[PDB]
Amino acid sequence: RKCSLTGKWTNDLGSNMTIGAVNSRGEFTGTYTTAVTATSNEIKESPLHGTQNTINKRTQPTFGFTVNWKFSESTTVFTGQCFIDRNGKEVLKTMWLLRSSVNDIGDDWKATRVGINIFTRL
Amino acid sequence: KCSLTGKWTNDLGSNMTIGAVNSRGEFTGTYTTAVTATSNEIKESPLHGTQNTINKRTQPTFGFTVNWKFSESTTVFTGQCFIDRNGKEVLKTMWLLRSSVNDIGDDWKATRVGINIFTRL
Amino acid sequence: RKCSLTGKWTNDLGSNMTIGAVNSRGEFTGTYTTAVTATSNEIKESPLHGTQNTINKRTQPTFGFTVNWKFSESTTVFTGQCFIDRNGKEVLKTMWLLRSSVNDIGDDWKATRVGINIFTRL
Amino acid sequence: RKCSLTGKWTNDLGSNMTIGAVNSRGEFTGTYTTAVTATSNEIKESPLHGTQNTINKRTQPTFGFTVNWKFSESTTVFTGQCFIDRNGKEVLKTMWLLRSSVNDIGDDWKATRVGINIFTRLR
Ligand SMILES: O=C1N[C@H]2[C@H](CS[C@H]2CCCCC(=O)c2ccc3ccc4cccc5ccc2c3c45)N1
Ligand SMILES: O=C1N[C@H]2[C@H](CS[C@H]2CCCCC(=O)c2ccc3ccc4cccc5ccc2c3c45)N1
Ligand SMILES: O=C1N[C@H]2[C@H](CS[C@H]2CCCCC(=O)c2ccc3ccc4cccc5ccc2c3c45)N1
Ligand SMILES: O=C1N[C@H]2[C@H](CS[C@H]2CCCCC(=O)c2ccc3ccc4cccc5ccc2c3c45)N1
Ligand SMILES: *[C@@H]1O[C@H](CO)[C@@H](O)[C@H](O)[C@H]1NC(C)=O
Ligand SMILES: *[C@@H]1O[C@H](CO)[C@@H](O)[C@H](O)[C@H]1NC(C)=O
Ligand SMILES: *[C@@H]1O[C@H](CO)[C@@H](O)[C@H](O)[C@H]1NC(C)=O
Ligand SMILES: *[C@@H]1O[C@H](CO)[C@@H](O)[C@H](O)[C@H]1NC(C)=O
């Protein structure tokens, strides 16, 4: 069918996320449980909010979301595309930017990390 | 505090308006790009995001998604709101622009990266 | 047993590269055969030039290199780190930037793609 | 007529680099003096090695180089294009990846930072 974002996912790093119903404007909300973190602070489940692109109602749509971490001053944004193979196996191929907080504008240059994640269903 | 609400323009000439930021840090708005990857006519597009409220920083991090209404593509922006040495607010952001590809074997080439600096308009 | 860049490698996309000897300053040269390309033009083997970081002569050093494509106006740069496991299996975890040419500076914004690659020995 | 990498440059952060002659294969070397650093160590001038793309011998070519930092375990790679306006004013629009060292492969995910730089000539 269409590749749908709703439901439960895990990534190559062991992180989980659950996304709820996608409304008619493509808006969704959920939660994200990272399996990894940059430092010793305790991981807390964090909210995410995003949109799926609905133009031409593609069966493999692009999308993006923001994770607003509840245990860091940082923000991660993820963007990717939902693929589906002939057996109906779904996968999200994503890239992210992780923005840290810096105290001063002179340190902005070092504030942004980059990486990928591949998510498959639970 | 450096506040996301209001009207902004970037180094490329794009405009965006962000509304009120609620108690969970959620905001919505609209984005008018000045530039585009292809010939399709530009349309104003919704954005949705969140500002980080931990320690209620006067210069908080944030992120938002632009759900383009004239492309199959998605752009995500993340940055931090600074209050500059001239007293001006400025958003320093980096973005990932995801294009749609028909086949998973082409995924590798789908994601572009860049920056934008926004100032108030 | 240090993780050494010299020799023949293949990545998750099927691309091959062969790196020669790494000199005492960490400098190396080689060739890169991509398995994929952005367009229809025929792929040609292309030169690469790089450096491995030698500070503290780490057994898992960072490195970078430039691929000077011989069939495109484009350039790709890769940067990563060479890892080992105790049975001696080496792997390079890398991220790349692929710079396309544009014929007007007003189009610079779109010129740069980003991704990852994982290489293992042949 | 062509935008040439050789010579002395400075970027929006204040960093300087000097690039030497670009040979017929497009190979160059030089030195990089960052104005900024992620941590307290004293900044040391560092070698760079790169190539400019010569396909179709464009007057505004792409290029890339690696900076092998002499004061960190880290590596930076820069890639971009040399632009030249009608008065002959040159500028390098670049983007970079900064790879830090991590002790364990389980930390790889956090190792890579991203950003941009714009360089203009020093006469
Ligand atoms: O599934 C996935 N998980 C990872 C990737 C992309 S998002 C990433 C999780 C990041 C959570 C924040 C974090 O680890 C964290 C934790 C504690 C920090 C303490 C102090 C910090 C100071 C500056 C910057 C930080 C950035 C992230 C930090 C922390 C800091 N995919
Ligand atoms: O303010 C800022 N503006 C720029 C930067 C980052 S977001 C970027 C604007 C992106 C608009 C979407 C687009 O270009 C677009 C439009 C139409 C497309 C039609 C067909 C496409 C086919 C493949 C790939 C595409 C990629 C982007 C496309 C389009 C396509 N900052
Ligand atoms: O092993 C790996 N392979 C891939 C990844 C990162 S490097 C990439 C291979 C790049 C080959 C050059 C290319 O695709 C290429 C070739 C011809 C082009 C002609 C015209 C272009 C116009 C705009 C943008 C381009 C981008 C890449 C192009 C070409 C163009 N890892
Ligand atoms: O002109 C430009 N300059 C900046 C940008 C991109 S390259 C960047 C300079 C990087 C110098 C290395 C560095 O800061 C550095 C120095 C010491 C470090 C010690 C320990 C580290 C541990 C983890 C990560 C690091 C990242 C950079 C580090 C260092 C570490 N443009
Ligand atoms: C992901 O979900 C599984 C069970 O449904 C659980 O074992 C695992 O702990 C979860 N991951 C994280 C990082 O919480
Ligand atoms: C941004 O706003 C200014 C002032 O209203 C306007 O003149 C300009 O055309 C707008 N730009 C775009 C891309 O809509
Ligand atoms: C890489 O090497 C393998 C084994 O030698 C070979 O079969 C394959 O064709 C090579 N790939 C490319 C892209 O040349
Ligand atoms: C670069 O050179 C300029 C003048 O040539 C100098 O004023 C500046 O301090 C130098 N910057 C660095 C980082 O060395």
Side-chain angles (χ1 to χ4, degrees), chain D residues 16 21 33 94:
Chain D
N16 297 333
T33 305
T94 67

PDB file of all heavy atoms in Angstrom, chain D residues 16 21 33 94:
ATOM      1  N   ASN D  16      42.827  31.686   8.514  1.00  0.00           N
ATOM      2  CA  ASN D  16      43.644  31.896   7.340  1.00  0.00           C
ATOM      3  C   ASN D  16      44.170  30.572   6.769  1.00  0.00           C
ATOM      4  O   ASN D  16      44.281  29.589   7.473  1.00  0.00           O
ATOM      5  CB  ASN D  16      44.849  32.746   7.663  1.00  0.00           C
ATOM      6  CG  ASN D  16      44.482  34.153   8.130  1.00  0.00           C
ATOM      7  OD1 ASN D  16      43.442  34.665   7.766  1.00  0.00           O
ATOM      8  ND2 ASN D  16      45.341  34.767   8.888  1.00  0.00           N
ATOM      9  N   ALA D  21      51.042  26.408  -5.404  1.00  0.00           N
ATOM     10  CA  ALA D  21      50.721  26.150  -6.810  1.00  0.00           C
ATOM     11  C   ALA D  21      49.858  24.892  -6.982  1.00  0.00           C
ATOM     12  O   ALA D  21      50.017  23.914  -6.251  1.00  0.00           O
ATOM     13  CB  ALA D  21      52.011  26.070  -7.636  1.00  0.00           C
ATOM     14  N   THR D  33      45.474  27.910   9.476  1.00  0.00           N
ATOM     15  CA  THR D  33      45.518  28.468  10.772  1.00  0.00           C
ATOM     16  C   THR D  33      44.098  28.793  11.172  1.00  0.00           C
ATOM     17  O   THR D  33      43.545  29.786  10.760  1.00  0.00           O
ATOM     18  CB  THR D  33      46.341  29.747  10.762  1.00  0.00           C
ATOM     19  OG1 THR D  33      47.654  29.492  10.228  1.00  0.00           O
ATOM     20  CG2 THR D  33      46.545  30.282  12.188  1.00  0.00           C
ATOM     21  N   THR D  94      32.288  27.175   0.654  1.00  0.00           N
ATOM     22  CA  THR D  94      32.625  25.793   1.083  1.00  0.00           C
ATOM     23  C   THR D  94      31.674  25.309   2.162  1.00  0.00           C
ATOM     24  O   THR D  94      31.133  26.106   2.923  1.00  0.00           O
ATOM     25  CB  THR D  94      34.045  25.683   1.712  1.00  0.00           C
ATOM     26  OG1 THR D  94      34.133  26.384   2.961  1.00  0.00           O
ATOM     27  CG2 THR D  94      35.097  26.298   0.749  1.00  0.00           C
TER      28      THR D  94
END
